[PDB]
């Protein structure tokens, strides 16, 4: 039975807002500006109070002639307002800042803030690794001008999650983050991110869902229904997993016994003398069939086999005549030039060398009628399991072309493990970059004073504290695969510890909350208004949780 996918169900209750009585103008406020989701909430809580997608519609009413504005969870109310949602991001960067300003106004309204001449609370913000100068210039401009914020700090969400799971702030470990638009590997020494050795792969969840959409479009070119992005996201979330060993799983992914358990079928939603001699021959055949049915059936089966062999030989001859480079075409050209370079028999040969395109079809129809008569005489007295292509489209079951339900079915057999493999082999997605395990190997075995063969104490402490974060770590089998690769390339007896939280998409905001609750190391990262007015927007605050300067 094929499961039916559709759009995700719409939200019913609208987004509420916090009471203005509990607001105080001195507590900090943490904002996780993500490419896929926004996470905001006050510092004194442990979980953020507002999680909604980063989206915005400019709703137009035909009757009231008024431009409306729906942000985030309020866009999850109508299908038309869901389909027209727009993001402020374009790739890994932000292009239009009016949308960001409107979204920030929306989330300031929903937090129950009563302001005066701007927001009095200092903000906590995340930023991309090695961000462009224009981005931090625009962020400084919009904050310190349109919102009058006293303090701003910038950091990477991976280091925030690492600080959340190592609150002492001086540990040594390795961070792997699988984000929406990129995947990063950052080594941490004594709580400070070594950004001269971080690496980035241009692949994320968005490229993975686009890859699945392209694979499904190329697999079924005559699919009558158009599928949306959210449906492909549901298929990516539900039936995709990381294989333990991709190099040998593809050899047995299309056998019949493996396809019994590892095949997913997805259903699209939809709404007189000759007559006397012939009669005597028929009577004699009926008497022979009543007298000896076994011998007559054997003779009819032999005649049907001879007719089938003749039809196969005729089809082989017709296929061989179609090849211009075949020896039959060369013999035809030799006979034709032999009638064009240098008797009744030669006349019959010239008559027999004529083209017979429709005569061959008529003879094939006559042979098919004769084979049908032979099958009827046998009754009176091509396997799809050997087709890899049939197993690739339609799985281990026979296919009915006339079934309306089978015309909307979609099978997922090779694509369950092919989609998540691109973060380990980026060449399959079109990026000429090394994989996750290759970058981790060249970090651990040839850097931080570690010759290949023996590990320094920094490398041992890095291996002992590996943390996996990011929203794209929801894929099953990721931790076991990374552990297997890591024990593959390391020396024997090395202790490997890999930590992954229950929800690896909310650890960054918990990192902001843990940094803001820790008062002592807060003040190394805050940037005042006077600081921005003195050293200008070209200013980078060097600290253990954020970016560094471009040069030395």
């Amino acid at each position: 039975k094929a499961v039916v996918i559709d759009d995700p169900p719409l939200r019913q209750t609208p987004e509420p807002f916090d009471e203005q009585s509990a607001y105080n103008p001195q507590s900090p406020i943490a904002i996780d500006f993500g490419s896929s989701k926004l996470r905001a909430g006050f510092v004194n809580h442990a979980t953020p109070t507002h999680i909604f997608p980063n989206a915005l519609t400019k709703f137009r009413d035909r009757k009231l002639n008024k431009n409306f504005t729906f942000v985030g969870n309020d866009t999850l109310l109508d299908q038309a307002v869901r389909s027209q949602s727009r993001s402020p991001f374009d790739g890994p960067f932000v292009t239009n800042w009016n949308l960001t300003e409107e979204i920030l106004d929306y989330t300031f309204h929903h937090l129950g803030v009563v302001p005066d001449n701007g927001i009095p609370n200092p903000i906590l913000l995340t930023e991309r690794l090695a961000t462009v100068q224009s981005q931090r210039t625009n962020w400084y401009q919009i904050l310190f001008e349109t919102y009058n914020v006293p303090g701003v700090t910038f950091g990477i969400d991976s280091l925030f999650s690492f600080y959340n799971y190592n609150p002492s702030g001086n540990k040594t470990g390795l961070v792997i983050s699988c984000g929406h638009e990129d995947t990063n590997v950052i080594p941490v020494v004594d709580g400070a991110g070594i950004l001269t050795d971080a690496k980035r792969i241009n692949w994320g969840g968005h490229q993975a869902v686009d890859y699945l959409n392209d694979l499904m479009a190329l697999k079924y070119p005559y699919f009558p229904t158009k599928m949306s992005y959210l449906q492909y996201e549901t298929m990516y979330k539900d039936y995709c997993y990381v294989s333990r060993n991709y190099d040998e799983d593809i050899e047995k992914i299309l056998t019949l016994e493996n396809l019994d358990t590892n095949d997913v079928v997805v259903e699209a939603p939809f709404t007189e003398r000759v007559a006397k001699e012939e009669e005597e021959k028929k009577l004699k055949e009926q008497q022979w069939r009543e007298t000896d049915l076994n011998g007559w059936i054997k003779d009819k089966r032999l005649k049907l086999n001879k007719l089938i062999k003749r039809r196969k030989e005729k089809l082989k001859l017709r296929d061989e005549m179609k090849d211009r480079k075949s020896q039959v075409s060369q013999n035809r050209m030799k006979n034709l030039a032999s009638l064009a370079e240098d008797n009744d028999e030669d006349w019959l040969i010239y008559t027999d060398i004529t083209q017979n395109p429709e005569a061959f079809e008529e003879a094939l129809e006559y042979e098919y009628k004769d084979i049908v008569e032979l099958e009827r005489l046998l009754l009176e007295h091509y396997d799809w399991r050997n087709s890899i292509l049939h197993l690739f489209l339609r799985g281990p079951r026979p296919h009915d072309s006339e079934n309306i339900h089978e015309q909307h079915q979609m099978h997922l057999n090779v694509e369950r493990i092919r989609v998540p493999e691109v973060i380990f082999q980026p060449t399959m997605g079109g990026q000429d970059q090394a994989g996750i395990c290759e970058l981790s190997e060249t970090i651990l075995l040839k850097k931080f004073g570690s010759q290949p063969g023996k590990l320094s104490q920094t490398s041992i402490d890095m291996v002992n504290n590996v943390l996996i974060t990011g929203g794209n770590a929801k894929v099953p089998g990721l931790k076991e695969r990374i552990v297997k690769e890591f024990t593959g390339f390391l020396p024997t007896g090395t202790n490997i510890t890999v930590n992954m939280s229950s929800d690896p998409s909310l650890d960054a905001w918990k990192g902001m909350a843990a940094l803001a609750r820790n008062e002592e190391q807060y003040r190394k990262t805050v940037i005042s208004k006077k600081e921005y007015e003195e050293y200008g927007p070209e200013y980078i605050k060097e600290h253990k949780l954020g970016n560094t300067k471009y040069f030395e």
Partner: protein, 104 residues
Amino acid sequence: SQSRSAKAGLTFPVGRVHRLLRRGNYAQRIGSGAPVYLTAVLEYLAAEILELAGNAARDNKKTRIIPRHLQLAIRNDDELNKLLGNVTIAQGGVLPNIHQNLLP
């Protein structure tokens, strides 16, 4: 230094067809891949015609290429006849064809 025909791995010239495209007033601007694409197409067409002509000349057991062999190669082939169903030939002749009932 060296010509563009060996740079693109061809025997037909590239600058010659670039020149002939230039003042042939087809357009006032001509890209760089235009002569190499035209050169490769002309390569393939001449090679195919020469293959079939050599096969017909060998089929005649005669060591030169005579336009009767060109006519045989043009009309024996299917889509070469379709491409050349308009052009009349010099000293080529007619392929032997007798309709079936004229044989007694």
